[PDB]
Amino acid sequence: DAVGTGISVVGQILGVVGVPFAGALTSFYQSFLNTIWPSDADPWKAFMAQVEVLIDKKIEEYAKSKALAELQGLQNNFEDYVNALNSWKKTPLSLRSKRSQDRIRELFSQAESHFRNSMPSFAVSKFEVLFLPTYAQAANTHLLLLKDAQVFGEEWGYSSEDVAEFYHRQLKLTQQYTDHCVNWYNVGLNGLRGSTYDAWVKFNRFRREMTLTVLDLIVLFPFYDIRLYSKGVKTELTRDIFTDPIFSLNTLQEYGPTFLSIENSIRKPHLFDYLQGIEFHTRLQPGYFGKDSFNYWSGNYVETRPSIGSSKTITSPFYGDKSTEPVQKLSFDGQKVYRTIANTDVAAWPNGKVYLGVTKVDFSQYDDQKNETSTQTYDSKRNNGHVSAQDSIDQLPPETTDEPLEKAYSHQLNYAECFLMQDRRGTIPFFTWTHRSVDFFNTIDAEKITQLPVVKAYALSSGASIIEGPGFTGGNLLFLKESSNSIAKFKVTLNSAALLQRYRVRIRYASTTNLRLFVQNSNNDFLVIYINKTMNKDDDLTYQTFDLATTNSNMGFSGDKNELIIGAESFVSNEKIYIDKIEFIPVQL
Numbered sequence: 001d002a003v004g005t006g007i008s009v010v011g012q013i014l015g016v017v018g019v020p021f022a023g024a025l026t027s028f029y030q031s032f033l034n035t036i037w038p039s040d041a042d043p044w045k046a047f048m049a050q051v052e053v054l055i056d057k058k059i060e061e062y063a064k065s066k067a068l069a070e071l072q073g074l075q076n077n078f079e080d081y082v083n084a085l086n087s088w089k090k091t092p093l094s095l096r097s098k099r100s101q102d103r104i105r106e107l108f109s110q111a112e113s114h115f116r117n118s119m120p121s122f123a124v125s126k127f128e129v130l131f132l133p134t135y136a137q138a139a140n141t142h143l144l145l146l147k148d149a150q151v152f153g154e155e156w157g158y159s160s161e162d163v164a165e166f167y168h169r170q171l172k173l174t175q176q177y178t179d180h181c182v183n184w185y186n187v188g189l190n191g192l193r194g195s196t197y198d199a200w201v202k203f204n205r206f207r208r209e210m211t212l213t214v215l216d217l218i219v220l221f222p223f224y225d226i227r228l229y230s231k232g233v234k235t236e237l238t239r240d241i242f243t244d245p246i247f248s249l250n251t252l253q254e255y256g257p258t259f260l261s262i263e264n265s266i267r268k269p270h271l272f273d274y275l276q277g278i279e280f281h282t283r284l285q286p287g288y289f290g291k292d293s294f295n296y297w298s299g300n301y302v303e304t305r306p307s308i309g310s311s312k313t314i315t316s317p318f319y320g321d322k323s324t325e326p327v328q329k330l331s332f333d334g335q336k337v338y339r340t341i342a343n344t345d346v347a348a349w350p351n352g353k354v355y356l357g358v359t360k361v362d363f364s365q366y367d368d369q370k371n372e373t374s375t376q377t378y379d380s381k382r383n384n385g386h387v388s389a390q391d392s393i394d395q396l397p398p399e400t401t402d403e404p405l406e407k408a409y410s411h412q413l414n415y416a417e418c419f420l421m422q423d424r425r426g427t428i429p430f431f432t433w434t435h436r437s438v439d440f441f442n443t444i445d446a447e448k449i450t451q452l453p454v455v456k457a458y459a460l461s462s463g464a465s466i467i468e469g470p471g472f473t474g475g476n477l478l479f480l481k482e483s484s485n486s487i488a489k490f491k492v493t494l495n496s497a498a499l500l501q502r503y504r505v506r507i508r509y510a511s512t513t514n515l516r517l518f519v520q521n522s523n524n525d526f527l528v529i530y531i532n533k534t535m536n537k538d539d540d541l542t543y544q545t546f547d548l549a550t551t552n553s554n555m556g557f558s559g560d561k562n563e564l565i566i567g568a569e570s571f572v573s574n575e576k577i578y579i580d581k582i583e584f585i586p587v588q589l
Contacts (some may be wrong), residue, residue: 002050004397006213011399017223024151047133070121077111101157115142129188136214139177146170147224178543182471197256219474235451236437238475243395257419269466273304277331281323287347295382296357309458309491320418335365337413343386357426359383366406446497452582454478457488470541480577485567506550506583518567525555
């Protein structure tokens with residue numbers, strides 16, 4: 001499946017990126033070949049067909065076969081290279097010959113060059129939204145390969161000049177490939193904007209599928225720069241994912257909530273939080289003949305708990321209709337809900353009125369602590385049998401199938417919200433999921449470079465707001481309106497090895513002015529960070545607008561109650577400052 005491969009690749013890359021030199025010295029390439037570059041090229045036909053199905057368009061035959069051809073040549077070159085590479089890696093120094101050198105280089109320049117020149121084949125005119133996943137996937141390989149030049153270049157025989165041409169190229173394409181993907185995503189996304197419920201479900205499916213397959217991959221590209229991130233990288237994807245509405249309004253399609261009411265009712269950008277519990281509200285759906293009436297869940301309240309550092313729960317507004325029957329409360333405090341299976345029911349009226357609603361949902365939860373799996377259920381307590389409906393794994397497959405689901409899932413439940421149908425047909429619920437990569441503990445690694453998404457803070461000041469991300473950061477950003485000393489507070493987790501260490505702090509931001517930022521910890525370290533102008537006010541948030549500001553003073557931590565506050569100095573209104581990640585580098589003096 002296109003999405004399943006995508007999800008699987010992003011899981012492999014996330015782990016490889018956490019290995020020094022982007023895992024360049026491990027056997028990652030073997031798994032990567034089986035998954036993305038298999039001999040039969042099945043994966044490609046899947047990506048090539050994935051978007052046709054989403055925008056309901058097609059890629060002309062010429063364009064489509066040319067692409068598969070370029071892809072055949074690329075798989076070959078690339079596999080050729082990987083084999084020459086395993087050899088090279090195994091060869092004792094003493095046994096490495098000029099023949100080996102000349103040969104491995106010749107292969108590298110061939111794969112890299114073929115890749116460099118193929119790219120346009122997946123970016124054809126009038127076929128950008130439809131070639132998207134293919135492009136992102138080939139791009140990602142070109143970059144995974146170019147970095148190899150910085151790791152092996154010198155022992156392969158390349159000179160300074162040669163090696164630098166590659167680095168320069170790498171920096172230039174990381175930017176280009178990133179921007180291309182975000183650009184065509186917005187173009188396709190916006191092409192699905194309509195006013196209907198139907199228009200929405202299509203709009204939200206492209207949004208999801210393209211995120212799992214492209215945007216989620218594009219965020220990893222910067223960690224291939226093994227000079228800027230030479231220690232391995234510990235990061236996470238924080239964005240929300242909306243699976244499709246729990247059941248399909250077959251004859252009811254027309255009665256679904258409008259586009260705007262759906263996009264204006266959904267929960268806006270916020271600090272990352274976790275599911276605590278769901279309060280189910282139930283009502284009766286009468287069948288015309290009474291014996292065929294059923295209870296279904298009409299509305300709900302949801303409780304979410306903030307990121308580490310704050311326990312206070314957040315109760316959402318009431319969603320949908322108040323119960324007519326008893327309310328059921330489920331609390332998932334301390335559990336990871338990795339799957340939901342809903343069952344539906346119907347009651348057709350002679351006068352043509354058909355009615356639907358959810359009579360049941362099973363929440364398969366997993367407990368990290370006790371390492372136990374269990375289930376929890378919402379049963380309306382009245383139904384004529386079970387028509388089937390949504391199974392989460394079909395939309396959000398796991399990272400591998402040869403792994404127990406509770407150990408291989410890719411997302412966890414985060415929110416549930418009911419929407420009402422027009423002409424009183426009932427309520428259709430929506431679920432929201434977050435990536436399994438999210439560390440609840442905000443752990444700072446002792447060896448690796450750690451990225452702390454700014455949305456992992458547990459508190460924000462009045463002058464700061466969480467805003468929708470540009471597209472290539474894997475989540476949302478913090479916008480700075482009013483500078484204060486406690487713009488945001490975080491609590492982080494360090495282990496013993498991590499406690500004996502000191503850390504240099506780097507900050508990924510985008511700003512229209514130079515300014516000083518301050519970082520404080522409860523260990524009384526106070527660091528001043530001068531950020532510089534990276535864009536003009538009238539600019540858009542593209543790849544080149546973000547940068548890394550750092551300080552030459554480091555900080556250390558103590559014990560188990562570590563907190564971090566970010567402050568800033570005053571700036572005039574009208575200047576835009578966006579902060580994305582706080583990075584910790586273990587200063588090994």
